[PDB]
């Protein structure tokens, strides 16, 4: 699984997933599934950010935490929007709202609600993608055009196929459920 991750995602994404895991004392060599999940989540964050006009999104995910909060503070004090209790993934200068992005190997609506309750914030938009091509957004708003979202979905499904092809997919779909329970 480890070797698969390093040739599936780019070094920058891998590099940042490693840091993210290390910051919390977790080891990518042992918890290889969570390693893959983090690379995936980052890739989706980046793609999502790229989907818009050039300066539309501030990227909050994939930074050192302290600098992230600083940028969040800047946005809140700048635009009037409420400070969220949990670190979001993006800010949308176009729509004037923070975005949390989810990637589940489980049901889109299940994951959506686990998130929605935890944040407990009306302002933060929520956007969930599955490895099977479904997506769910708050108020049925997807932010991006159909083209952008389709590229994301395609990419996720490619990751699933690539894992399945090597026998790593079952173990990976297992991990999330076990983590939840
Ligand atoms: O699993 C995901 O989708 C994450 O986005 C995970 C993440 O950011 C993280 C950060 C620090 C430690 C462990 C996971
Ligand atoms: O799951 C996700 O989509 C996250 O975006 C998770 C995340 O940011 C995080 C940060 C710190 C600890 C655990 C998860
Ligand atoms: Mn995040
Ligand atoms: Mn997220």
Author numbering: 1 to 50, 50A, 50B, 50C, 73 to 196, 196A, 196B, 196C, ...
What does the paper say about this structure?
The RdRp is a heterotrimeric complex comprising subunits PA, PB1, and PB2 that associates with the 3′ and 5′ ends of each RNA genome segment. Translation of viral mRNAs by the host ribosome requires 5′ capping, and the necessary mRNA caps are cleaved or “snatched” from host pre-mRNAs. Here, we present crystal structures of PAN from strain A/Vietnam/1203/2004 (H5N1) in complex with six known or predicted inhibitors that allow us to precisely describe their interactions with the PAN active site.
Compound 2 has also been structurally characterized in complex with the La Crosse virus endonuclease, and it engages the two-metal active site in the same fashion. However, in the PAN complex, two copies of the molecule are bound in the active site. The carboxyl group of molecule A forms a salt bridge to Lys134 and hydrogen bonds to metal-coordinating residues His41, Glu119, and Ile120 (carbonyl) and to H2O122. However, they did not observe the second bound molecule, and we suggest that this is due to the higher concentration of 2 used in our structural studies. To confirm the stoichiometry of binding of compound 2 at the higher concentration, we carried out ITC experiments. These ITC analyses are therefore consistent with the structures in both studies where one or two molecules bind PAN depending on the concentration of compound 2.
